[PDB]
């Protein structure tokens, strides 16, 4: 249900969605 | 009886979530504001 190249970097979260579901 | 009332009650939550996204408004709102903020950021690049 829930849904560039100019220095804008999106860091990944530390707890991946697999771990959170754990 | 309570088991049946509890089991059915979980059942409705699926259907409310399955069809209508109005419940998920609050999380979706956070995504829009942040995503929309970046669009304003890159847009300012084209401005003279």
């Amino acid at each position: 249900k829930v849904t560039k190249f100019n220095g804008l970097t999106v860091l990944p979260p530390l707890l991946t969605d697999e771990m959170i579901a754990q | 009886l309570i088991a049946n009332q509890f089991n059915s009650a979980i059942g409705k939550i699926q259907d409310s979530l399955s069809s209508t996204a109005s419940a998920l408004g609050k999380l979706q709102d956070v995504v829009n504001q942040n995503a929309q903020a970046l669009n304003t950021l890159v847009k300012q690049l084209s401005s003279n």
């Binding site: 560039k4 190249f5 100019n6 970097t9 860091l11 | 890159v42 847009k43 690049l45 084209s46």
Partner: protein, 87 residues
């Protein structure tokens, strides 16, 4: 030159990027493509009517992993968001 980080200017357009062949099909009149942010991503080669994508050259933050210098001086470097080829 394609598939390589090259500084380029097409029809005097200018810029730096990685020139790659593009599957996107321009309409005959068009010459320059653009992205959502109105950033040049595709061009039509002047001499040969070929449609080239502009992919900006790779880059990212460099993070340093270190245990406290009190413990040791060995260090590990984290190159963010780059495949282990560009290094």
């Amino acid at each position: 030159v394609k598939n390589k980080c090259v500084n380029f200017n097409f029809n005097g357009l200018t810029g730096t990027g990685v020139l790659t062949e593009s599957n996107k099909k321009f309409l005959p009149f068009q010459q320059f493509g653009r992205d959502i942010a109105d950033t040049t991503d595709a061009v039509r080669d002047p001499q040969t009517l070929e449609i080239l994508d502009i992919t900006p050259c790779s880059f990212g933050g460099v993070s340093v992993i270190t245990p406290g210098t009190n413990t040791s001086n060995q260090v590990a470097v984290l190159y963010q968001d780059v495949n282990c080829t560009e290094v």
